[PDB]
């Protein structure tokens, strides 16, 4: 239970802005959409504003609002994300794609007025040029996964972990090992959960009326494990 929680009882409009630079390649992405935590549902649409993306759409999914996760009642006390609202939280990650480069990200998620805003910068290095990433060798798809959460009393927030399995055109799968940390931007109290995870599924598609490089995303998230 948290006041922040009261901010997500309805459908909330979403804002997404990303500035990134991978192996010097620069780009920007914008997303608009809405979230319905009651159903743990996200529906967003992403647009490249800088032309054909240097990396695949699927590698940016993680980066591109866990506060929209559906917390069943018996877990309401474990919802750091909502509790940090409206002030928000900073979400930082280091993502390692096996046998390739890595992304380092930092973002701020908070309300801006009535819109929940996800503001991110990303920096990627070491990609192998003809690698699955620079190679655009991944399938435009996505698996369900479990995101593990635990409290970080010293950070006054959480420590998050998981491993993304990206399907590869040759029928192989490439791993994107995720390390994440979240901390409150604000100074009010937050919920510091016992250990748990989020059951997450995403489905990507495309907008037939859309000319720019883009991604249509639908995602369902529900907390479990306590």
From Swiss-Prot:
Membrane-spanning residues: none
Effect of residue 152 to V: In EBFP2.0; shifts the excitation and emission spectra to shorter wavelengths and increases quantum yields compared to BFP
Coiled coil: none
Effect of residue 145 to D: In Cerulean; leads to improved quantum yield, a higher extinction coefficient and is 2.5-fold brighter than ECFP
Effect of residue 66 to H: In P4; leads to no detectable fluorescence. In mut2.2; shifts fluorescence lifetime from 3.03 to 1.94 ns. In mut3.3; shifts fluorescence lifetime from 3.03 to 1.88 ns
Effect upon mutating residue 30 to R: In mut1.28; shifts fluorescence lifetime from 3.03 to 2.76 ns. In mut2.2; shifts fluorescence lifetime from 3.03 to 1.94 ns. In mut3.3; shifts fluorescence lifetime from 3.03 to 1.88 ns
Effect on the protein of changing residue 195 to S: In EBFP1.2; shifts the excitation and emission spectra to shorter wavelengths and increases quantum yields compared to BFP
PTM note: Contains a chromophore consisting of modified amino acid residues. Maturation of the chromophore requires nothing other than molecular oxygen.
Biotech exploitation of the protein: Green fluorescent protein has been engineered to produce a vast number of variously colored mutants, fusion proteins, and biosensors. Further generation of mutants led to more stable proteins (at 37 degrees Celsius for example) with brighter fluorescence and longer fluorescence lifetimes.
Result when mutating residue 168 to V: In EBFP1.2; shifts the excitation and emission spectra to shorter wavelengths and increases quantum yields compared to BFP
Effect of residue 172 to G: In GFPA; leads to enhanced fluorescence at 37 degrees Celsius. In Venus; leads to yellow fluorescence, improved maturation and reduced environmental sensitivity
UniProt-reported outcome of changing residue 159 to Q: In R10-3; matures to the red-emitting state with excitation and emission maxima at 555 and 585 nm, respectively
Phenotypic consequence of residue 65 to N: In R10-3; matures to the red-emitting state with excitation and emission maxima at 555 and 585 nm, respectively
GO-annotated biological processes: bioluminescence; generation of precursor metabolites and energy
Keywords: Chromophore, Luminescence, Photoprotein
Outcome when changing residue 200 to H/W/F: Results in significantly red-shifted excitation and emission maxima
Effect of residue 66 to M: In Citrinine; leads to excitation and emission peaks of 516 and 529 nm, respectively
Tissue expression notes: Photocytes.
Similarity annotation: Belongs to the GFP family.
Function noted in UniProt: Energy-transfer acceptor. Its role is to transduce the blue chemiluminescence of the protein aequorin into green fluorescent light by energy transfer. Fluoresces in vivo upon receiving energy from the Ca(2+)-activated photoprotein aequorin.
Subunit structure: Monomer.
Descriptive protein name: Green fluorescent protein
Lineage: Eukaryota, Metazoa, Cnidaria, Hydrozoa, Hydroidolina
Gene assigned in the entry: GFP
